[PDB]
Symmetry: C3
Subunit: 485 residues, 3 copies
């Protein structure tokens, strides 16, 4: 009479295919997708403060477009700028539009403190029929269209010191009229000038008296410039004409605020990661939704699928063990022992090796990857305009980052899956050689992941081999007589 102890591992009929260093496509028992390929479709408004620019750009809310009067003094961690947005005030252009938009977005607040500028000998609060405030004519609420008073426009020259402890942002402008008649009617001088200076900075702009396309009934423009006044510094606005003055300063801050062009609707939910396609869950280490991200988002990768083997290698199917096949009928644990003796066939898992493999497998990826990279303000990555050098450089930087992180994700998945598979085979072989070392001369490796044990082995003794208390010398005198004789 002899016994048989086969060592084995769990298998599943539902084998998931993964990628490794050594195999293009290998079948494992379980796998987790690391690439968030689909979004919720909606921008969840927590924990980040989401400001919906329903029909307003950021610059139109800054300047005070009347339909953006509902954005006076609004703060945000993300400004969602809709493609539906339009302007309904005096036609304007921002030289260096993207820089102003970016610094106002990172500022995270349109907190406008009005200041007592003493514009003397000049008519304030100029207006236009291209911005009906409500009824009648108006203008940007955060600007002051100055025009001649009587028969002259003096050389305006005012100062404003920054005695506070923060950067002030002064949004000013220059009026480019259409005709010299319009110039000399608004500003008596034949060609104006707007200088705005600090102790360390300068901008001087000569207006551009020339006609141009009719936008809301005007062949004139406002060229919007800005000036950042540091603490202790001082602003000076000098002007010979064509000045669109500021009424005050925008309280600059520095923080996690940003801006995002999106058309997805906001919804009352919770999500750390926001994309133009909506909020996504940050549970996975990579994504494929969009490269434009805000918050604790995963990394963007070109790959649409990257399956990490969070389980072992699958070999789905005389009680032969692991050298031949894996066991489908073992859910008690990962690695285990089947056994055949006179007291009846049976099975029992080994939670030691199972729990070792799970302890190594449960926390694999989170010890070579980041928490979830919190990126709040980044470069622009979707361009509507054609600009050339700086746009191509931004595109190239982002494409470089994307290709590098895609390669890193591919190599990481391959390495971690190869290590998972070698680790699980290692635990199986370690259990095998452990049981070999318990059965010094009382057993023989049959070659199918199984020990033929040459003494009568009741289920108590099979359990003794399973749990490690098996003393070989009790049965040695019998097993040698059954092996070599």
């Amino acid at each position: 009479s002899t016994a048989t102890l086969c060592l084995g591992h769990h298998a599943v009929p539902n084998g998931t295919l993964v990628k490794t260093i050594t195999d293009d496509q290998i079948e494992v028992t379980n796998a987790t997708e690391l690439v968030q390929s689909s979004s919720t479709g909606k921008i969840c408004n927590n924990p980040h403060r989401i400001l919906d620019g329903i029909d307003c750009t950021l610059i139109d809310a800054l300047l005070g477009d009347p339909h953006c009067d509902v954005f006076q003094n609004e703060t945000w961690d993300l400004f969602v700028e809709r493609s539906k947005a339009f302007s309904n005030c005096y036609p304007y252009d921002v030289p260096d539009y993207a820089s102003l938009r970016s610094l106002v977005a990172s500022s995270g607040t349109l907190e406008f403190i009005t200041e007592g500028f003493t514009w003397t000998g000049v008519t304030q609060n100029g207006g236009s029929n291209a911005c009906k405030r409500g009824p009648g004519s108006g203008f940007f609420s955060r600007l002051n269209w100055l025009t001649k008073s009587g028969s002259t426009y003096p050389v305006l020259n005012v100062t404003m010191p920054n005695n506070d402890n923060f950067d002030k942002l002064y949004i000013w402008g220059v009026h480019h009229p259409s005709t010299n008649q319009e110039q000399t009617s608004l500003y008596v001088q034949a060609s104006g000038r707007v200088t705005v200076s600090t102790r360390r900075s300068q901008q001087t702009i000569i207006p551009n008296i020339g006609s141009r396309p009719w936008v809301r009934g005007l062949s004139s423009r406002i060229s919007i410039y800005w000036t950042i006044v540091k603490p202790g510094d001082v602003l000076v606005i000098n002007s010979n004409g064509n000045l669109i003055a500021p009424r005050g300063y925008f309280k600059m801050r520095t923080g996690k605020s940003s801006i995002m062009r999106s058309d997805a609707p906001i919804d009352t939910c919770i999500s750390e990661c926001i994309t133009p396609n909506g909020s996504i869950p940050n549970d996975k280490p990579f994504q494929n939704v969009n490269k434009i991200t805000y918050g604790a988002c995963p990394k963007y990768v070109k790959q649409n699928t990257l399956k990490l083997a969070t389980g072992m290698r699958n070999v789905p199917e005389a009680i032969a063990g692991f050298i031949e096949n894996g066991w489908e009928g073992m859910i008690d644990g990962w690695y285990g022992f089947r056994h055949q003796n006179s007291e009846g066939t049976g099975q029992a898992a080994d939670l030691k090796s199972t729990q070792a493999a799970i302890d190594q497998i449960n926390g694999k990826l989170n010890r070579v990857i980041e928490k979830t990279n919190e990126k709040f303000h980044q470069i622009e990555k979707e361009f509507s305009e054609v600009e050339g050098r700086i746009q191509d450089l931004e595109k190239y930087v982002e494409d470089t980052k994307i290709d590098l992180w895609s390669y890193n994700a591919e190599l990481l998945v391959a390495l971690e899956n190869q290590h998972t598979i070698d680790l699980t085979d290692s635990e199986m072989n370690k259990l095998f050689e452990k049981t070999r070392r318990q059965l010094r001369e009382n057993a023989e490796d049959m070659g199918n992941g199984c020990f033929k044990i040459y003494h009568k082995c009741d289920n108590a003794c099979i359990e003794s081999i399973r749990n490690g208390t098996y003393d070989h010398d009790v049965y040695r005198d019998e097993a040698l007589n059954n092996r070599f004789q």
Copy 2:
């Protein structure tokens, strides 16, 4: 009488040295270079459309330099700009030259549609002796040098709507004369002005009446600007003077087109990857030729050599096996069995383990690397000018990319070679323990990668061990009597 079965692997006298994680320099049987270090020397003109700018820059072909009249309406996937190139027309400078060059290169076409601009009260088709068209005086063929008609130069003011479904590109200019006499002779106003506007954009340029170096007999210049008109938009050209008008618009496209500064000649061959040094083969995953690439090119790496072990570890040299030495006299396969019995010494490979190792080794690198990264338009990376901030940023981005990809290539080669070596030793040891499991108690591991088999083993039985049909129990009663007695 006893037999002897040694297991072994192929070896070669021509051992190639490679790098791993664990060994600085280890000898393997075969190795493939992954870094394309040398070029063909010629730019192959397929599958990409290569336009040879024989003596023409891209901007001189855009504007219509007479010796670039052969580039009217030419399209390309790559514009090869020769260092031999020169200008032979009115001296000019492009403020933001690189941006115009880049967007015209990505445009991939100089398709110029002439438009009926109504320049009234003004003499069109001005010319110069600094561009002989052929005989006589001429000008850029895609521009229109306007000058006074009679005794006055009116305030030119024309419009052109973009009712089409593509971006129009209007290349216009401003004439900077040398003297006020030249100004008031060409343009009656003492100081001109050129405004070019759309519903959302602006450029207004006051000319610069001042002398400057004589280039082709002139101390005057053309400052070339551009304006991109989106669909539905409208262009307006206003001017008080010094206008170099456009005759039409360049049909902007968006695609795989680009530009490359090179002196290599074009040749009728096929190659996906183009560099300034010539076309190179894209068979290898990395390169060292140049960082400037067009097409399906490998990645640039600082390394000049990176040998991937596409073979196993080399140990070149009583029929002792793999624990001692490798076999030079085995080409039948990778892993194999030598044997010594009474019926004569012999040898035979094992195609199972050989083909396993080759199946794992043939497709290693192409399951963690990209297809071949198709990069068409990228930043400029070789600068002739000194520009400071943007140039240093482009250089830093490219050097960052190069160092990162060089490190990735080094780590990848080390990892893949270490995995190759461990994999081949693993297949050898797996075959060894397989043969151990076939020879349960009939054999003994001699310690030189060899089993001394303690029964008479004819060549049929050695083949039985080789192919897996060896049943131990037939010879057990004899082998135990020969081992322990």
Copy 3:
């Protein structure tokens, strides 16, 4: 009588914790920090030439601020710009300040060659009380404030050819006065002009007659521009007024020079790597001190600690061997043999496997990492100003690089530590199976990393097993009689 040979490895009570692919926190015998987290606090002035800008910016030393007269013609490999720096001359602003600063820093020399500009009909060597040279009024020493001579300011128009073999750098300026009275008093024309041109370049600047904050007693400014003249080219300075001419040219070079904002003091020591926090040792492959680097510096990584296992796995504690525990009482070598026989217990290391493991472990990281990346001039990474697009792009490039290199460092440490641990366990198991192959049938694996040897084994024979000369057949007839009987 029987003997016992246990194989084992060294252990230490001082176990250092490290990170791997398979274990979050595993205990090893020795570990090296790869992240230089602390600096010396001082900038060591060798081998790089360090120029201490004690109270001088680079532009103030370029132009010739009087308290920077001690920096005439100074050369550097690194210009240390102090936060204590101030200007004490005519108030000025540099449009494109950062580009001029960067190209003058990479130039690595303020070598100023004076040229014989023939400014005729005009008063040279203008001065101001905002730069007392020493006593009296003066100006920038490398500029020439031109003013009217008598009752007229002619149209200045001079040329200067670059007949040399290097780029010349001409630093010129434009005077923006406060009042039209000041303009027409200094420069008779009501609105000046400064054109500076070459055969391929242009800059024309109309001054800005407007008041502005009083800096050192003046509401006027100098707008500093530059012009780089290549070999064979020619400079032409034309001016209707408001010209701040150059007295000569700065000899541009190209090399390892750079600039760094720092407050750390210089000290006479030796160090290749300089940061604003001081010089640091470049012995480690990564750092956490600062991302701003000059010289042969390590790579910046967000991690503050990254311990590389330069030793094996620690298992600190009947002479049981390596399967159970590691040995604390073995310093002779890494892997070794303990033994118990009738001639007394004893111990002896195996320098073969020890030296194999050390040869593999001593040079691990330096065969997948770089020498130490020499980066001399890079982008600016700490910004005092808010600028928007280009600043955000520089920040994003550097943050991308930092996150990528941090991930690479983490993955590299995990991989190299996992390979160290698997390599050391591999050498231990290889020694174990070597000793198994020496003791073919004379021994039995007890299961605690130990062979019970079934013949009397004097210390000479234990040494025979240790050094490899052990012939099994001498003791086989006795060991079989002691094992199976």
